[PDB]
Write a protein that binds this ligand. Structure first.
Ligand SMILES: CCCCOc1ccc(C[C@H](CC)C(=O)O)cc1CNC(=O)c1ccc2ccc3cccc4ccc1c2c34
Ligand SMILES: CCCCOc1ccc(C[C@H](CC)C(=O)O)cc1CNC(=O)c1ccc2ccc3cccc4ccc1c2c34
Lengths: 265, 265
């Protein structure tokens, strides 16, 4: 349909406008101001002095390396929350929802969207960081002391299988919109209107995958499963973050993310 | 360092001296000879009769409205090229470069600088024009016939995110200097000296952002990404201008801008 093709294009354009990183851009960088490679402690500290200088400008009062990394991770999440919040306005019906339902959908959806989109900047060896200006190796992240090395590998495991689906940005934009439109989120006021909004987005996603990936007749049910996998990945991630919060006094959690996690799992 | 703080101040002062519009001045006007508002064809024609009278003094031989606007756009670029060329003399090492390298750096840099600086006079509803004496609405520019309505919106999209960084003129001056000092421009003779000049400016920019924006530890990598975004914005802009040149006989391109675009993309 013209209105359904147009809806898919509108969501794709809103994704291209509101997220600083997209998959085409990420793959250009990942192929080879080129990205500084962080693969050990020396190169981590070098990258920090150039890319987050204030974070390491405190001398002997600088935090432990793992805590500095954790802080950088949190800051990226706060930025993506801002991007996701503006993107959601392109979803038909989202801006017509009650303000409290908009909050609830974004609360439960943002981390599922975050890890879906982080797949775009990950390969089997590492990931882009710092607005495309660093590449940090998967092995270096595994080398961090517990519990910080435990954040990383489950997301790589998810991303490698997600990337094997060979989605492009036109697919991922609709997938992220579908994540945001989940009517079964706890605490929703107008569940019925949200289910209809969801049905509309999922309908556009199904038709789009049919046109864009004629070679994979299971791609839509596969992505439905990936949405469930992401919900579980986020539940587990929240649990690990709570361990870090309780056992690592220096790993302070940003207030916006504290509110997202609050009463989640 | 005293010499690095002084370098940042020197570039800021050169920016204040050489560009007719700056962000403080622009925000004063944009808040409210006040700016005449161009929001439709009637008010466009009124503004033209006062601000560019010769352009509409030909009666039935006047060009189409979209072509007149395109001509005004080009004239602003020619003026900014003059301003940028004098500004570049404040960059340490630029005036010591070979004349041909100075030309090459300005050739590839001016339109990236132009769209970075135009952000200062843009808000979500429109932009200042005509030396602060007009404000033209974003919706009116979208209303122009194709292909002229296609020039405008990508620059607003860039500017809204660029302006959300809340840079001031002391930041933007160093950013524009960094744009001009790109050592990877095609055809450079003394790449090594240019990379050292670039390193010096980028070093001053990094330290300045650290001092001036202690609240945003990612601001430097964000601006590195904006430089890449601007390069792509300019590539796309050159392509659209070439379409207009081929398909619109009345939209003659000024010879100086023709030389800038020649062998660019
Ligand atoms: C898991 C596999 C991806 C690893 O990444 C994540 C992990 C978790 C989350 C969710 C967070 C967890 C606290 C949240 O619960 O909210 C987010 C990310 C994104 N992490 C990053 O983008 C990132 C990483 C490591 C770094 C190391 C050195 C660096 C130097 C300078 C700038 C950097 C910017 C971004 C840097 C970075 C930087
Ligand atoms: C894109 C969003 C900004 C729109 O603007 C641009 C677009 C492109 C470029 C680059 C040009 C394209 C050909 C180049 O490739 O070189 C430059 C600009 C600046 N454009 C302007 O400053 C501007 C606009 C529209 C107008 C409408 C009516 C007017 C009446 C009287 C005086 C005016 C002065 C300046 C007027 C004006 C005037």
């Amino acid at each position: 349909t013209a209105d359904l093709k147009s809806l898919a294009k509108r969501i794709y354009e809103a994704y291209l406008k509101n997220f600083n990183m997209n998959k085409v851009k990420a793959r250009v960088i990942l192929s080879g101001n080129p990205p500084f490679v962080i693969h050990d402690m020396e190169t981590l500290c070098m990258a920090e002095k150039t890319l987050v200088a204030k974070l390491v400008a405190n001398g002997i009062q600088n935090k432990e390396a793992e805590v500095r990394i954790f802080h950088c991770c949190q800051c990226t999440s706060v930025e993506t929350v801002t991007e996701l919040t503006e993107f959601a306005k392109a979803i038909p019906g989202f801006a017509n929802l009650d303000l409290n339902d908009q909050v609830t959908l974004l609360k439960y959806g943002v981390y599922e969207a975050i890890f879906a989109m982080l797949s775009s900047v990950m390969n089997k060896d590492g990931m882009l960081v710092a607005y495309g200006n660093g590449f940090i190796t998967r092995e270096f992240l595994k080398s961090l002391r517990k519990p910080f090395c435990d954040i990383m590998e489950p997301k790589f495991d998810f991303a490698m299988k997600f990337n094997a689906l060979e989605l492009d940005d036109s697919d991922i934009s609709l997938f992220v919109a579908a994540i945001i439109c989940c009517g079964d989120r706890p605490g929703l006021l107008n569940v019925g209107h949200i289910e209809k909004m969801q049905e509309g987005i999922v309908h556009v996603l199904r038709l789009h995958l049919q046109s864009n990936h004629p070679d994979d007749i299971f791609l839509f049910p596969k992505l439905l499963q990936k949405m469930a996998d992401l919900r579980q990945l986020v539940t587990e991630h929240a649990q690990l973050v709570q361990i870090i919060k309780k056992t690592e006094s220096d790993a302070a959690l940003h207030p916006l993310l504290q509110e997202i996690y609050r009463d989640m799992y």
